[PDB]
Amino acid sequence: PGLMAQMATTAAGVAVGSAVGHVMGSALTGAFSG
Amino acid sequence: PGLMAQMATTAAGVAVGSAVGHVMGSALTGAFSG
Amino acid sequence: PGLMAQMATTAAGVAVGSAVGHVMGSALTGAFSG
Amino acid sequence: PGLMAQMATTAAGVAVGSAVGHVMGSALTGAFSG
Amino acid sequence: PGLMAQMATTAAGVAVGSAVGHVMGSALTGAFSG
Amino acid sequence: PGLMAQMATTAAGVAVGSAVGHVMGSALTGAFSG
């Protein structure tokens, strides 16, 4: 395989190119648990 | 295979190119659990 | 295969190019569970 | 005023949660010209 | 004013949570010209 | 004013949480010209 990817992404309180007065973010990730 | 991808994406409180007074975000991810 | 993708996407409280007074978002994802 | 926003947004070739073979996009913006 | 925002946003060839074979994007912005 | 923002944002060939085979992007910005 040219590219194999198993990705677990978590995003909270993300501002991209924005005019935001206040940002709050809480993120939790549990991945690849045996 | 040229590209194999197993992706689990979680987004909360995301502002993109926006004028937001206040942003709140809470995100949780559980992936690839055995 | 040129591109194989198994994607689980969750979005909550997303503002794109918007004028929003207040944004609330809660997202949870469970994927690829054995 | 609580929130005053003058926004000029341009989007071309945008794929959101989609399975697209090929995407082409050309965008131009002229804003707030004196 | 609590929040004053003059925003000029340009997006081309944007893929969000998508399985895309190929993405092409060309974006140009002219803003706040005197 | 609590927050004054004059923003000129340009995005091309942006992939967010996506499985993309190939991404091409060309972006140009001209802002705040006298």
Numbering used by the authors:
A (entry chain D), B (entry chain E), C (entry chain F), D (entry chain C), E (entry chain B), F (entry chain A): 42 to 75
In the authors' words:
Mitochondrial proteins CHCHD10 and CHCHD2 are mutated in rare cases of heritable FTD, ALS and PD and aggregate in tissues affected by these diseases. Here, we demonstrate that the low complexity N-terminal domains of both D10 and D2, as well as the full-length proteins, can form amyloid fibrils in vitro and in vivo. Structures of D10 and D2 fibrils assembled in vitro from the low complexity N-terminal domains of each protein show that their core comprises the most highly conserved region between the two proteins. For D10 and D2, the central conserved VAV motif forms a beta-strand that is associated with the protofilament interface in all the structures we have observed, suggesting that it may be a critical element in fibril formation and may be expected to appear in ex vivo structures as well.
Using cryo-EM, we observed several distinct D10-NT fibril polymorphs (see Methods section on Cryo-EM sample preparation and data collection) and determined three different structures. The first structure we obtained (polymorph-1, 2.31 Å resolution) revealed an ordered core formed by residues P42-G75 and containing two identical protofilaments (PFs) related by pseudo-21 helical screw symmetry. Each PF contains three beta-strands, extending from residues M45 to A53, V55-V57, and V64-A72. Strand-2 forms part of a beta-helix-like turn structure, commonly observed in amyloid fibrils, connecting the first and third strands. The interface between these PFs is formed primarily between the tip of each beta-helix and the N-terminal half of strand 1. Strand-1 adopts a very similar conformation to that observed in the D10-NT PF1 structure, as do the last five residues of strand-3, and the two strands pack together in a nearly identical manner in both structures, with residue F73(D10)/F84(D2) packing against the equivalent Q47(D10)/Q58(D2) residue. Similarly, the location of the equivalent residues in the D10-NT PF1 fold suggests that it could accommodate D2 molecules. In the case of p.G66V, the PF2 or PF3 structures could potentially accommodate the mutation, but it would not be consistent with the PF1 structure and would therefore be expected to eliminate some of the possible WT PF folds.
